[PDB]
Symmetry: D3
Subunit: 133 residues, 6 copies
C-alpha cells in the first residue's frame, strides 16, 4: 500500500490548456499525455499551412512535454493519431516518422468527425519515465 | 515474476453491461474504466435532456465505478471524451470541470461519427488506486 | 530508479507494419497493442467478407501478438473497438465475445469516420503480462 | 521522486514489551524485521524457569504473537537466527523449533554466543515477508 | 526479463575507510546494508580511547556519516545489531544509542560476542530503507 | 489486495544438504537469504581437514554452488557475515575471501563467536539480490 508519485506536468514551452485538462500526468512511472493539436505555444493558435505543419507542431509540443518530464521520444510506448481526413495518412506518417526515430511506439491512427479548433490532426501519447532497458 | 492482482470492478450503482465488457478492470494499481454513456443505472436507458444531462449521468456513473474500486475522481489520470457533436465542446467542458475539481487528468476530446444507443457523449477513463502522493 | 524492461513485440504471425509503428510494446508488465485491421498476415491485404470476417481476422492477429509476448486473451485488460458503421455493433459484439471468453476487458466501442485501407473495424488493446491472480 | 513505502512498528501485549529504543518488529514495504526474542514471560519480565527447552518454547510463542500482530504466521518466515548459550543444546532446541514449521523452511543462522541479555540460554530472531507468497521450487 | 535494480557502493571519507574486500555500506533497490562499525577514529585507524561509552559514541557517529552518504538519516534505520565485549555494558551503550532515535524505533539484535575486530568493546551494524517512508502504526 | 511474491527454496546437491527444518537458501522477491555455510564436505558430512584456511575455501565453494542454484554468482552478494572461532584468523580467511570478489564489494559483518556448529573454525553467510543489477557509484 505504498503511496505512488503523481505529478502534473506543466511547461510554458507547450500550449496553455483550452479546457479542463493537464498537459500530462506522471503517475508511478507512466506519463499520460493529452491530445496535442498543432497550436503554437506562445499564442495558442493553430499554425498555418494545414495538416503537415500542424502535425509537426503537435509533435514538437509532445516533445516539450516529454522533456519537462525528463523524457524524450524514445520513452513513448503508445500514440494515438487522430486525423480530420484519412487522405492525409501518408503525409502525417512521413512527419511522424521523423520524430519517433526508433523503438517505434504502438499506435492507433484513424479519421474522426471533427477535432477542437478545427484542427486537422491531434496526437496523444503514453510514455514511461526512464531509465528503460 | 510476481502474480499481479487483477479484479473485475462491478457495481449495481452503475449501468449493466450492454455488450461483452466489464465496467472496469483493476490490474496492479491501474484501473481501466469502460466508456460510459449517460445511461440511468436502474433502467439502462439514456437520460432525457440531451448532451448536458447525458454528460452528467456518464460522469456520475464513472464516480460510482471509482467508488467501488476504493477511489474518487482525484484518482483519475487520463480521460477520453467522445462527442457526437463538436459544437457541444463548451457545454461538456463546463459539466466535466464540476467533477474533476483538481489534479485535472490528461485528456483527449473529439467528435466521433456515432456512439452506441445514439448517445451524445461517452467518457472513458484510466485511474490509479491510491494512496497517491 | 530501476531500469524497466521495454521490448518491441514482433511476430511474422501478424501482419507487417503499414506505417511507423510496432505491433506492440511491452514495458514493465504492460503491453500496448497497436490497432489491428482485418489483414491477412501473409499478404497484408484485408480479408474479404466484410466486417464480420475482418473482425475475426483482427482478433486473430491480436491473439498472435499476445502469444508472442507470452500471453493470451485472458491477459487483456482494455480494448478499443473502432467501427466504420455503428449498425455493425451487434455483429462485431458477437464475434468479439468468442475470443474474450472470461474476465472481459474494459472497453470503448464507437463509429469513426474512416479507418486505414478502408477497413470496417479496427481493434486496439492493452494487456498485462502474467502471472495474474 | 520515489514512492513512499509503508512502515509499521509492531507492538503487541502478547509478547514481552520492548523496553527502551527498540521495537518488537518493524515492517517496511513487505519485509518484517523481528527483534531477537528470549524465553521471557510477557507478564513476569524475566525468563521462564526450567532451562533451554522451556525458554525455546516461550521464545517461539513470543515470535508467533509478533508475527500474528503483523498479519503473518510462521509460513512467512524466510530467515531465522538461533543464538545459544551452549552449542550442545542445538538438538534440543531444534526439536522445539521443528514443530513450528512444516515445509518451505527458512534459511538459518545458528551458533553459540558469549552471553545473551537477561542470562538467556536461547534467543531467536527472524525475517518474514508479508503475503501472499507463491512457492515455486 | 526483470528490471535492473540500482546498487550503490557507499564510500565516505567521514567514516573509517573499508580496508579490503568489503564496503562501508551497499544500497540495493531501496535497502541499505551497513557494515558493522567499531569505535574507530576515521583519521587514526584505531579505537578512540576511554572505553565502551566513548567507542559507542564514535561508532554511532560513523554510522551517521554512512547514512548521510546514502541520502538517509537515523530515521531510515529499520534494524540494528549491537555487539558487545561485555553484556554488562548494555545499559551504558543503550544510553548513548537512545540519543540517536526519537520514535519508530528499529528492530534490534544485541548480545555479547567472543571477540570483535581491533579489540573493540562495541560494534553497531544496521539496515536502513531509503525514503520516503510512511509510518502507519 | 497485494501481489503474490515469488519464493524459491534453494536445494543443490553440490553443497552440504540442509539436515532438518532449514534450507540452504530462500529466495523471496529478488532477495536471497543464504544460510551460514561451514567448511563441510558435501559428500562426507563433516569438516574438511587442515584448519581454518581449508575450511574457508570449502565454505566459499559451498556458497558459490548455492548462488549458482539460485541463478546468481558472487557479484550478486550485497552483505556477507564471516564468523570465526579465532579473531586472529581474520587475515588468513580474508586472503581466501578476497579471491571471490573483484569489485562492488559486499557489506560485511565479521567477528569471533563462542562456538560454531560441528566445531567449525569459520562460517560464512550471505544476502544476495537476483540480477540484473546496475551499479551507479
Amino acid at each position: 500500500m505504498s503511496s505512488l508519485v503523481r505529478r502534473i506536468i506543466s511547461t510554458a514551452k507547450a500550449p496553455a490548456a483550452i479546457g479542463p485538462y493537464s498537459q500530462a500526468v506522471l503517475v508511478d512511472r507512466t506519463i499520460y499525455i493529452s491530445g496535442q493539436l498543432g497550436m503554437d505555444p506562445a499564442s495558442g493558435q493553430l499554425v498555418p499551412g494545414g495538416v503537415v505543419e500542424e502535425a509537426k507542431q503537435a509533435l514538437t509540443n509532445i516533445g516539450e512535454i516529454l522533456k519537462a518530464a525528463g523524457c524524450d521520444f524514445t520513452n513513448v510506448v503508445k500514440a494515438t493519431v487522430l486525423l480530420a481526413d484519412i487522405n492525409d495518412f501518408s503525409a502525417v506518417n512521413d512527419v511522424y516518422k521523423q520524430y519517433f526515430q526508433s523503438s517505434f511506439p504502438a499506435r492507433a491512427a484513424y479519421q474522426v468527425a471533427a477535432l477542437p479548433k478545427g484542427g486537422r490532426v491531434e496526437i496523444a501519447a503514453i510514455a514511461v519515465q526512464g531509465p528503460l532497458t
